[PDB]
Amino acid sequence: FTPKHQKLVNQCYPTGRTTDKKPKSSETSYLLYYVNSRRSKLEKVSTYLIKRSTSDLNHRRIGNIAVTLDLMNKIVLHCKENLNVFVKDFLYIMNKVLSNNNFNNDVSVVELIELAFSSICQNLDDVLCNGDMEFVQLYQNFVDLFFKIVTERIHNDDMLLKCCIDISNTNSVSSNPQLNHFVSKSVAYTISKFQERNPKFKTLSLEATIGLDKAAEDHDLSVKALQSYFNTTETDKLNLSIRTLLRCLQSTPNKELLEFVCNGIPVQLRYIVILLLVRQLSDKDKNVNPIVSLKLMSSLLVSDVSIVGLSVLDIMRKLLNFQLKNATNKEVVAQSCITMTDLNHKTYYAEQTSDMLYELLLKLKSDTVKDVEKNAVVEDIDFLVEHITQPSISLELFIDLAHYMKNHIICLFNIVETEVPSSILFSKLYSLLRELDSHGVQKEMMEEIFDKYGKMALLSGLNYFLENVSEPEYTYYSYHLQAANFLKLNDYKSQTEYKMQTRTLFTKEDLLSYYSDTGSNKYSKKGAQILLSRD
């Protein structure tokens, strides 16, 4: 007695004892039809494949096993929408084959095995991923055996790369606890085998077409694996992939590798990398060099790699805070002093630069912070302004900041492009200008202030310095000098020189004599106005 399924399945096999057996065409077609018709047939046919392939394992016939694996592949592909019926069976058989040292040798067997595995992984439902435990152990066993065999008996790293791609193509493995580690070990292996070929990325370059998007033209399999694990919108997979990347990057620090893999990662959410890098500082591991991660952040932020939608403020605040907690090191303070500005390298929005500086100012104003935080922030603003190429300051911020570092105010002033300031802001500016260490700084400051706002500085300076100054100071005389220089008046300059070399002050009348004729001074009317309209 031979039931139909048994006869069909057996009818798919050739007669001999050869090892290059390919399943007979028409018979396997009709078999596929038969199992695809009613799902009751898949049960029978799959179970029968288990028993039969067991007998073929015993009598040690490779051909029948090859045909078997081929059939299994074709069935998986044909009966996808019912895959959860027979997957555990096929996996049991594949593991049983792999567990057999008489079938491990043959390369074709392992090839067909991997093929069946790829066709499986590509069509899985999360149903067994989460519900069934036996399936989890069969999958686990398969991956373990496959690595343990290909590494030792097949000696074909390409097989392992294909397996990594299979795991990557499996549904929600990165979202599964029991099967999580396989993603990590896969990424680790493809990385280490991508640093094996192209050993350039094994270099210790950490300070100073390349893209992966253009490297996917096809070719090396390692790159295909990288694209498989990094070029993805699946957040979990990318989480684990990046984490493993950073981990394998602590051992072989390479900025170009990071650049490459980032070129692989979808442009949209690359910010996540940075986040993890930042988190890498907060980590308690102690086998992680924070300096390495900082330099890697820097290397990333400087280059062409677009990092859309970065929470610049948040990241900066985190870096700064980390620098304040550990502030007694040249490395923790300087590499942060560098990365912090390296992050401003690109302008995500106009308010950012100001905001950055502002975040520091607020920390400086409070007396809660320790001396070394003061010093560190000072050096930070120092570096920032040293790297701020073009103007972006609200004059008030320039004032609050000016109070704290009188050495680098000039530079800060070159960043203020407020075309029109308030009349009070002027008096503030002057009032702080009076409180300055050197007269050189006061001189050049007065000069540039006049340069930017000739009319407004003339008038506001006139009023202010007339009212407030009651004793010979440098700022007073420098104002009158710059005013005379702006009005191109020899008598004004001469008199100022007198009042300066004799420590005397100007009176309302003396200054009135310069704002007398509109043909001699364009601004005579407003000047005289504010000169006599007060007291």
Curated annotation (Swiss-Prot):
Cellular component terms per the entry's GO annotation: cell periphery; mitochondrion; plasma membrane
Keyword Magnesium carried by entry: no
UniProt keywords, alphabetically: Phosphoprotein
Disulfide bonds: none
Origin: domain of life: Eukaryota
Record keyword Nucleus present: no
One biological process term in Gene Ontology: protein localization to plasma membrane
Extra facts: Present with 1670 molecules/cell in log phase SD medium.
Family as reported in the entry's similarity comment: Belongs to the EFR3 family.
Name by which UniProt lists this protein: Protein EFR3
Gene designation: EFR3
Full-protein residues shown: 9 to 560 of 782
